[PDB]
Symmetry: C2
Subunit: 55 residues, 2 copies
């Protein structure tokens, strides 16, 4: 179960969060920019949870 959850988390999100995201879904126009909320702190806690999972 641990290795399955680690593989799914790598496949969906990766192990970082970018501050600027680009969106191409209807019913928006061609391409819009969307800005996340505190991505640095979430990157730090994602790295901590990854380390705990590996241990």
């Amino acid at each position: 179960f641990e290795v399955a959850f680690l593989l799914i988390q790598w496949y969906i999100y990766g192990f970082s969060l970018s501050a600027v995201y680009t969106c191409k879904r209807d019913p928006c126009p061609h391409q819009v920019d969307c800005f996340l909320s505190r991505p640095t702190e979430k990157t730090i806690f994602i790295i901590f949870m990854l380390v705990v999972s590996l241990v």
Copy 2:
């Protein structure tokens, strides 16, 4: 002078006006949509001025 002005007006604008224009200039994002103001009436008057010019 008449044929020069007709050639310049054909080269810049054409002889119609579309109701939806797409814009790709800085400092906007990737592509935005911009909507004109009464383009049908302006198309009609452009056709009248073209006919008067040719006559």
